[PDB]
Design a binder for this molecule. Structure first.
Ligand SMILES: Nc1ncnc2c1ncn2[C@@H]1O[C@H](COP(=O)(O)OP(=O)(O)NP(=O)(O)O)[C@@H](O)[C@H]1O
Lengths: 17, 354
């Protein structure tokens, strides 16, 4: 499989605060 | 002929095994196969999405019935982004005719075992995958449940790096009371206290398993393999070094304590020599998850708070179960006939027309 930018949970963590 | 047209719409066969999941589920394709279940993807004609379906045929074996019932009861009660959900359960309308159980789940793309056969993960992916394992485990443990069988093949991944824990047939409520003697495809992720037949197994056995998985993500090789528990314990000691005296007399089993004391000394091998290209913060957390004494082993909420995971740590969005489960089953002594009735009862809510 071809595998951080598109994960929903990762977006929530990037954009906290 | 209508009957001839009905038989064309009959049960699909996958790799020589029957999958009788119509009329709702069609267009089946092989995914994988564990020691107990056969897993296919299928198209859900009601919810209009592809799904995963695991077929189990358990009713001749007490141990298969235990795994079927435990997985179903636990996953139906869990609801968490990093734990696989059960969408549906297919079985015959009468207990007489029920021979197979099909557990329908959200479809994932692969599992970490398969992924590690094909590529070396970057540190960034390892970090995010480890975070999600621990986040799901935090929920499991908050319900007072031990997974007891975490390993790469039951960490599911999709194409957007989301991870979900599956395979709950060994999961049990924690309690101070033949643990894990039943067959499993791999014992390489089990805590040493299980191999030494210590008695008081706790949440820490799952953390050990996660430490084994992290080690394997770092090198693409299992860290404590071995043919027998003796061989696995020797590989553990060959890396961690000989246990301390304090760690020893924390062991309940006098017999296992005596054997370890007889073993020749082993010095601890530094993690950076086993994992020279690895992130030093990953190795610090790895060290705390692979600590021999389960009482000293890092807990899941401490591990989430470790510096290696700091960019994902968010206690406001790491949910827990509403109530910790209580142990009121003791199904490990129920006969398989009784287990079948309970499975039938637990699955009645999914029958068409309920
Ligand atoms: N929801 C799912 N989506 C995609 N693949 C899945 C899913 N559930 C299971 N699989 C795959 O099927 C394999 C076997 O499933 P699993 O639930 O572990 O089976 P088991 O036979 O009951 N227990 P085990 O022997 O421990 O693997 C997994 O390792 C995955 O590769």
């Amino acid at each position: 499989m071809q595998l951080l930018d598109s994960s929903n949970l990762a977006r929530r963590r990037r954009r906290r605060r | 002929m209508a009957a001839a047209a009905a038989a064309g719409a009959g049960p699909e066969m996958v790799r020589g095994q029957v999958f009788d999941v119509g009329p709702r589920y069609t267009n089946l394709s092989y995914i994988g196969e564990g020691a107990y279940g056969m897993v296919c993807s299928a198209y859900d004609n009601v919810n209009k999405v592809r799904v995963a379906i695991k077929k189990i045929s358990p009713f001749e074996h007490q141990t298969y019935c235990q795994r079927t019932l435990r997985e179903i009861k636990i996953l139906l009660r869990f609801r968490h982004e990093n734990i696989i959900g059960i969408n549906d359960i297919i079985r015959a309308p009468t207990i007489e005719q029920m021979k197979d159980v099909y557990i329908v789940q959200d479809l994932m793309e692969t599992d970490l075992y398969k992924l590690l056969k094909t590529q070396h993960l970057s540190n960034d992916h390892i970090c995010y995958f480890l975070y999600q394992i621990l986040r799901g485990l935090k929920y499991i443990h908050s319900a007072n449940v031990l997974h007891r069988d975490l390993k790469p093949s039951n960490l599911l991944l999709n194409t957007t790096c989301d991870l979900k824990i599956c395979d709950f047939g060994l999961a049990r409520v924690a309690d101070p009371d033949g643990f894990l003697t039943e067959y499993v495809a791999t014992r390489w992720y089990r805590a040493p206290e299980i191999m030494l037949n210590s008695k008081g197994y706790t949440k820490s056995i799952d953390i050990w398993s996660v430490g084994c998985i992290l080690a394997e993500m770092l090198s693409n090789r299992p860290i404590f393999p071995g043919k027998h528990y003796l061989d696995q314990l020797n590989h553990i000691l060959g890396i961690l070094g000989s246990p301390s005296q304090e760690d020893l007399n924390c062991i309940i089993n006098l017999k296992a304590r005596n054997y370890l004391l007889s073993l020749p000394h082993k010095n601890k091998v530094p993690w950076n020599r086993l994992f020279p290209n690895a992130d030093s913060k990953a190795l610090d957390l790895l060290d705390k998850m692979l600590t021999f004494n389960p009482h000293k082993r890092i807990e899941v909420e401490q591990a989430l708070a470790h510096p290696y995971l700091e960019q994902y740590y968010d206690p406001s969005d790491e949910p827990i179960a509403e109530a910790p489960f209580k142990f009121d089953m003791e199904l490990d002594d129920l006969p398989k006939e009784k287990l079948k009735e309970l499975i039938f009862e637990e699955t009645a809510r999914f029958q068409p027309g309920y």
